[PDB]
Design a protein around this ligand. Structure first.
Ligand SMILES: [Mg+2]
Ligand SMILES: [Mg+2]
Ligand SMILES: [Mg+2]
Ligand SMILES: [Mg+2]
Ligand SMILES: [Mg+2]
Ligand SMILES: [Mg+2]
Ligand SMILES: [Mg+2]
Ligand SMILES: [Mg+2]
Ligand SMILES: [Mg+2]
Ligand SMILES: [Mg+2]
Ligand SMILES: [Mg+2]
Lengths: 94, 136, 82, 56
RNA sequence: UUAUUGGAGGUAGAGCACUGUUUGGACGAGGGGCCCCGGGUUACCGAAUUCAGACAAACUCCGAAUGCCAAUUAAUUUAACUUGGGAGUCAGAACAUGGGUGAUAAGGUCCGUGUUCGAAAGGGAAACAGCCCAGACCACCAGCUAAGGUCCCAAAAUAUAUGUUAAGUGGAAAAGGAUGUGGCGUUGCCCAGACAACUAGGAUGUUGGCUUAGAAGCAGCCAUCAUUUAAAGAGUGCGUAAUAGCUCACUAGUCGAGUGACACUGCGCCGAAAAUGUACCGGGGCUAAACAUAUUACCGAAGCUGUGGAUUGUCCUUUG
RNA sequence: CUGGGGCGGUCGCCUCCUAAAAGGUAACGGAGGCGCUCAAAGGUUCCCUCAGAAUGGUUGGAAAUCAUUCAUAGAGUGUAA
RNA sequence: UUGGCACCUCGAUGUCGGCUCAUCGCAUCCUGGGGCUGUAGUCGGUCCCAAGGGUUGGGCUGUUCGCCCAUUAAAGCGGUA
RNA sequence: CUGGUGACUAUAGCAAGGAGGUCACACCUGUUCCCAUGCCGAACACAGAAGUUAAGCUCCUUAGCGUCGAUGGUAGUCGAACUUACGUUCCGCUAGAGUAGAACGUUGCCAGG
């Protein structure tokens, strides 16, 4: 239930396009106990984890040094490309 | 033949065809569906031909949902006329389809049966298509 | 050469050049038309009169300010320069 | 201070862009101007960035 | 002109709150076919309601980018306005792009916007008003560049590096069709023996039941099970009027390494028939002299620069 | 005027869409109105709030008038938008 | 082919049919070579290759067409103002 | 604290539950008078105070609805390069919807407690 992520800076349209081509997925982390953080996660790894935990399963996100348990609040998908364009992670109060 | 019972305006501007599908890009009523990968007008006749083909192969055991409806009327001038002197009479009814739009949805059959049924439907339609399933 | 029918349309009225006549933050002399409109899309504000045709006009010399007037309404006002 | 050179011609270009090139003080093709750096100048350069080369 | 700030407005997109359009679910206000003033329940459920999903130039709960109007506004630039003398013009064209019309026809037609032509020579696009580069004061057997190019025609790389293509693709076209070939993933089986081949079996109830004149595994329907297994379907096909017969699925051996499916992609293939002569690279020719991605050179104009000269402004300023 | 002319249609004015979120903008483009009306349907002062639906009630019926509740405007605004 | 458009030609680009002379394309009428066939043979059907040569005389109609008579291996379809 | 009267885009509303009454505000009691009903003292008006917090009203709780609402991403788009592709690429701007969240108001002046 753990997948590593990398933080992101301000991005141009080209950068995000390169990220998705690389196979990484742009994402944001929000919720209780966390400020909004923009993160990138590998698509394949995310898909494996979500299968293990399910759609609403709690996930351990390696947000920089800290690790935050998160849920997939929402995701954006491209039907033609069969690719997840964006993922929203909601922090869960424990 | 699917067509609107009434319209406020019988003579309408032809729809914009450039761009990607606004909605109906996900299978919501059935297990499987046919996704358009190209843009074209879809006529009421084309819908019926595709519908009849898919139902026959399915043998009516499965349920067919037709996602697209031909709302827009289109006109044609009478034959051998010069330009001008007003717009022509209504000739047909069409649905604008852009890449991503799910044309039809099928349920109550095995995938193999659905794939063949949608294949038979695809050959009746102007656009290029891809077989699609509900995504979770 | 096939014979042809005719359209029953082909008519339109003259355009009435409605809309803003003066900018927000611009000085205007008294009597200056600020906005031309049918009904009250913009309401008469401070030192601004509404004509019989719903034209908005400055009632004094001053600066034009377009202002909100509740959730879904707007008004135009004129304020005298110091 | 920035040095702006008109590397590409204003022929075939929209008039509004031509006005900006005039405003920057650029004249004939390959002409140069030396101007102080400020936001207003940068905006003019931004409008005609395709037509000019900038050196600091 | 730009920056900064304020404002008007409803387009693109989006959305369905309104007006219409529309798909699939449920669900019923109220009685009829139906079962009692004495009750019920297998249409219509049309009212309505609800959940999910779509559509709109003349729909909008929303709503940009731009453009527009301004500012005792700053930077840069050089116009602007008024009055008076003299005009010409009122057939426009292409291209790009936002639209109407036409057929998401026209080198069509009609409006918005920009550019060029018109009224513009020079270089490129073989030739080619309107495309691309660029605006010719005059002279030079000087230099640097643009678009476009660098094997020969024909000036400059037979340049460098790493791949792709085999179709002269490059150097005209579609639905659709295909063990062409390259790349990046996903997944099944496999030296406790994969895939293919070869050898052997491939059975019994049973010719399963109905149908049909006939249906025995193989015209059409219902079910699709037990038994001996080292394995067998109430049969994937060929075949018989029905049979039969052949064969397959599946299984056990021989050799031993890979073998199968799926998704996303690069570049190619077929689909592809017209009239004087090759004739859809400008030619020769090219397997790179094609294509992709980088790197460094060079060529290339009447552009820019150098030198001399002309005319007219401006500024220094008798001078020049 | 006219996608040659004739024939057909049209000619002024108003409203909308085309119109590309200022304004303006064409085609024999898509839709409709006008050549009035009102002596109050004008002015002012004061007062007032709809359509529709449900339920109850006689003549009375889906629908007349009455009553309560809900109803934010789906009403009305002389006459197109 | 019937049209759409109105771009060269109105200080002239002669217009239907026939006659004379042809010439080219191939989507092939005949003849030559094939595949498949619901191909026994003789005949056919359909498709592929193939443009070398060949592809008749009459009645009616200005006719092009078209019908008809009699043939022929066949009586091809188009372009060339 | 309460009341009168103002400001603000409902974060301010709606709904539901609860609480409160020397004064105040109502309900309320009458119609003699001012005044009133297209009938009606219902309302309006006036004269009052027996009764009552029942309701309105005020206060408290709440997030069901309505309202507000990011960040991130997406659509669209100015400009540019490339192309003619129902296009591509780069840059700036940047929604709508949805999500986290906000929110059962915040305040000015005057008179009382
Ligand atoms: Mg108008
Ligand atoms: Mg739209
Ligand atoms: Mg134009
Ligand atoms: Mg050479
Ligand atoms: Mg050089
Ligand atoms: Mg020069
Ligand atoms: Mg406008
Ligand atoms: Mg505009
Ligand atoms: Mg013309
Ligand atoms: Mg002559
Ligand atoms: Mg041939």
């Amino acid at each position: 239930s753990l997948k590593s992520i990398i933080r992101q800076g301000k991005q141009t349209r080209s950068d995000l396009k390169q990220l998705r081509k690389s196979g990484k997925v742009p994402a944001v982390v929000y919720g209780y106990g966390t400020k909004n953080v923009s993160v990138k996660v590998d698509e394949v790894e995310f898909i494996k984890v979500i299968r293990e935990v399910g759609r609403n399963g709690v996930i351990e996100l390696g947000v920089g040094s800290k690790t935050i348990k998160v849920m997939v609040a929402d995701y954006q998908f491209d039907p033609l490309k069969n690719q997840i364009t964006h993922i929203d992670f909601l922090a869960i109060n424990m | 033949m699917l067509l609107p019972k009434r319209v406020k305006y019988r003579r309408q501007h032809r729809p914009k065809t450039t761009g990607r599908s606004k909605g109906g890009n996900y299978v919501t009523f059935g297990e499987f569906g046919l996704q358009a990968t190209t843009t074209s007008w879809i006529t009421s006749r084309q819908i019926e031909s595709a519908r009849i083909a898919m139902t026959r192969y399915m043998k009516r055991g499965g349920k067919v949902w037709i996602k697209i409806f031909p709302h827009t009327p289109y006109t044609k001038k009478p034959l051998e006329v010069r330009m001008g002197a007003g717009k022509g009479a209504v000739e047909g009814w069409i649905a604008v389809v852009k890449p991503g739009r799910i044309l039809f949805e099928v349920a109550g059959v095995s995938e193999e049966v659905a794939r063949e049924a949608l294949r038979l439907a695809s050959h009746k339609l102007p656009v290029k298509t891809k077989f699609v399933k509900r995504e979770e | 050469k096939k014979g042809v029918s005719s359209t029953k349309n082909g008519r339109d009225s003259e355009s009435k050049r409605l809309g803003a006549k003066r900018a927000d933050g611009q000085f205007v002399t008294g009597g200056s038309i600020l906005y031309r409109q049918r009904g009250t899309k913009i309401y008469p504000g401070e030192n601004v009169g509404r004509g019989g045709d719903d034209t908005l006009f400055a009632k004094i010399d001053g600066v034009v300010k377009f202002e909100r007037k509740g959730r879904d309404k707007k008004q135009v006002s004129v304020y005298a320069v110091a | 201070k920035l040095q702006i050179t008109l590397t590409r011609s204003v022929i075939g270009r929209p008039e509004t862009q031509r006005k900006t090139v005039e405003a920057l003080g650029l004249k004939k093709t390959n002409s140069s101007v030396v101007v102080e750096d400020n936001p207003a100048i940068r905006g003019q350069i931004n409008k005609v960035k395709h037509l000019v080369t900038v050196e600091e």
